[PDB]
Amino acid sequence: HGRNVQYIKFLQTIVKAEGKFIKKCQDMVMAELVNSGEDVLVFYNDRASFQTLIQMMRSERDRMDENSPLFMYHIHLVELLAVCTEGKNVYTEIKCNSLLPLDDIVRVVTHEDCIPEVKIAYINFLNHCYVDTEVEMKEIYTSNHMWKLFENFLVDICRACNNTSDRKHADSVLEKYVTEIVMSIVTTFFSSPFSDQSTTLQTRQPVFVQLLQGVFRVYHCNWLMPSQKASVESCIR
């Protein structure tokens, strides 16, 4: 019938209630995505997804007529497969990594021009596979490979951090980007340099800059408090 951007926001409403996430429904919606095969896939490899997304957001704003192009806004509302096993509802994460984006090899491919809109949902997939809370298999590539994304996107966060009272999605991106910081502490193994010369300067000084912008923001104080803890928690890492 066609992949509807208007429709695909249903797939989290029926399964995922607020607060509570049941295990059986997630199991029976995970297997059908692999079984059907021709669902709304995020794989729009580098030649395709680059020029579509940069022209979708920059040329038109305010949702671009409810962001219903059928090719670029489809990924945005495809969070079901990204938040399918986000918190702890991961009966089998191998399927989500093999049949779906790995979150450490396919994420980088589209990272040439970082799009915060994709990152929020795509970053949630990184949280989905990285670790539910502990069960993720200990893979050096999962953490060592993902330890360079922050540096690549750290400049982007800093670049938009200096802009004050000029955007609305910055708070959401900062609020949505702090969720990963609150997850498992940064690794301190042979890899994952453990706040070395190139891993501490860009992880502590820049963090305060984002915290300073949030403190100066006129938004609610509910989200401002977590930012200080996020930087504080990272500092004590």
- H/I helix tally: 13
Write the H/E string, N to C: HHHHHHHHHHHHH
- What class do helices, strands and sheet pairing give? mainly alpha
Total strands: the figure is 0
The dominant shape is: globular
Distance between the termini: 50 Å
Q: Helicity, in percent?
A: 55-70%
Query: What characterizes the major β-sheet?
Result: none
Query: How large, in whole angstroms, is the Cα Rg?
Result: 18 Å
Percent strand: under 5%
Structure description:
The protein has 237 residues and is mostly helical. It is 55% helix and 0% strand. It has helices at residues 23-36, 47-59, 64-67, 73-76, 79-82, 93-98, 106-109, 116-130, 140-144, 149-161, 169-181, 197-216, 221-236. The protein is globular and about 50 Å long. The N and C termini lie far apart (50 Å). 22% of the residues are buried. Belongs to the InsP3 receptor family. It is found in: Endoplasmic reticulum membrane; Cytoplasmic vesicle, Secretory vesicle membrane; Cytoplasm, Perinuclear region.
Please supply descriptive tags for the structure shown above.
237 residues; globular; mainly alpha; 1 chains; part of a larger assembly; 13 helices
Architecture blueprint of SSEs:
Layout: H1 23-36, H2 47-59, H3 64-67, H4 73-76, H5 79-82, H6 93-98, H7 106-109, H8 116-130, H9 140-144, H10 149-161, H11 169-181, H12 197-216, H13 221-236
Helix pairs in contact: 8-11, 10-12, 12-13
Subcellular location: Endoplasmic reticulum membrane; Cytoplasmic vesicle, Secretory vesicle membrane; Cytoplasm, Perinuclear region
Family: Belongs to the InsP3 receptor family.
Protein name: Inositol 1,4,5-trisphosphate-gated calcium channel ITPR1
